[PDB]
Amino acid sequence: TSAVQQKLAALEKSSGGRLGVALIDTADNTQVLYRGDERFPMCGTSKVMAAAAVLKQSETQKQLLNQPVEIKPADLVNYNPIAEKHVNGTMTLAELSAAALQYSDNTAMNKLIAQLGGPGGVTAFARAIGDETFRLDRTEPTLNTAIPGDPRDTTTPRAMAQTLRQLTLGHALGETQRAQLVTWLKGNTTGAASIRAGLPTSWTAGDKTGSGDYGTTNDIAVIWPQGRAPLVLVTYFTQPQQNAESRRDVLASAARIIAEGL
Numbered sequence: 001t002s003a004v005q006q007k008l009a010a011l012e013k014s015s016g017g018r019l020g021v022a023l024i025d026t027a028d029n030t031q032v033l034y035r036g037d038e039r040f041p042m043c044g045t046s047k048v049m050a051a052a053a054v055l056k057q058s059e060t061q062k063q064l065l066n067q068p069v070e071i072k073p074a075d076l077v078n079y080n081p082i083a084e085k086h087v088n089g090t091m092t093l094a095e096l097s098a099a100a101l102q103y104s105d106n107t108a109m110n111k112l113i114a115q116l117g118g119p120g121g122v123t124a125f126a127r128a129i130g131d132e133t134f135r136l137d138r139t140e141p142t143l144n145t146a147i148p149g150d151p152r153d154t155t156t157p158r159a160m161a162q163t164l165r166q167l168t169l170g171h172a173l174g175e176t177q178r179a180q181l182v183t184w185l186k187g188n189t190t191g192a193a194s195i196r197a198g199l200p201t202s203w204t205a206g207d208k209t210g211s212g213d214y215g216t217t218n219d220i221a222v223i224w225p226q227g228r229a230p231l232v233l234v235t236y237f238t239q240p241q242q243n244a245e246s247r248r249d250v251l252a253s254a255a256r257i258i259a260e261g262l
């Protein structure tokens with residue numbers, strides 16, 4: 001048990017919930033894990049895998065991202081800030097990817113899932129890039145039930161960090177596609193209270209949040225510290241009761257412990 005791991009355990013102790021952390025410092029490829037191999041509900045953090053899978057398809061079905069997708073009134077789910085504006089019209093797969101990632105639009109996510117042939121199509125992409133842990137089982141919004149002990153729509157912090165590294169800094173995607181993914185993550189609108197809130201102001205980052213029942217509060221990020229090689233950081237958090245409140249502050253604290261321990 002390292003000093004950083006002990007600090008994360010202390011944070012978890014006062015948090016009321018269960019915390020999972022995985023850092024990969026590309027300066028030396030070292031990792032810092034806390035409950036790194038335990039499963040957590042991904043919620044919206046799964047949107048990165050879906051968008052990346054569509055980016056991979058676009059490497060060979062070249063005009064895929066410009067392909068229109070019909071948005072019907074019945075497609076709308078619980079949170080669709082972008083899709084609702086296009087009901088009875090269309091959005092391209094690039095628009096759907098941007099909406100899913102940057103606004104966490106759930107209807108947009110469902111269109112990515114549908115393009116991939118269902119939740120299993122997202123899992124299939126995960127397997128193709130070496131992630132044997134990730135599993136997407138349901139569409140939005142039920143993939144957010146986040147029931148303790150339920151393996152559906154879960155992953156481990158270790159697996160997600162390795163995957164995010166491969167996708168954003170490695171070669172799981174073509175160069176243009178990796179750049180597009182990084183651009184989308186950097187333009188996220190929903191992350192300032194999470195991982196980012198625990199980083200020095202001078203650092204830059206891209207991230208994708210997730211939230212669900214059981215006060216499930218997640219964030220996965222690629223970070224560029226001042227004067228350092230990039231980091232990949234996953235912070236997952238989930239609580240014992242279905243109606244628990246969101247705790248983005250716990251993710252921010254975890255990120256601060258990680259930054260202070262570099």
Ligand SMILES: CCN1CCN(C(=O)N[C@@H](C(=O)N[C@@H]2C(=O)N3[C@@H]2SC(C)(C)[C@@H]3C(=O)O)c2ccccc2)C(=O)C1=O
Nearest residue numbers: 043044045078079104141142144145190209210211212213
């Ligand atoms: C079948 C019954 N059932 C299961 C429970 N459930 C949900 O927990 N959905 C969450 C959700 O959609 N989360 C998606 C997600 O992650 N993103 C989007 S929304 C967001 C911007 C808060 C978030 C982000 O980026 O942080 C959600 C959480 C917190 C408040 C409202 C909704 C349902 O939706 C649902 O219907």
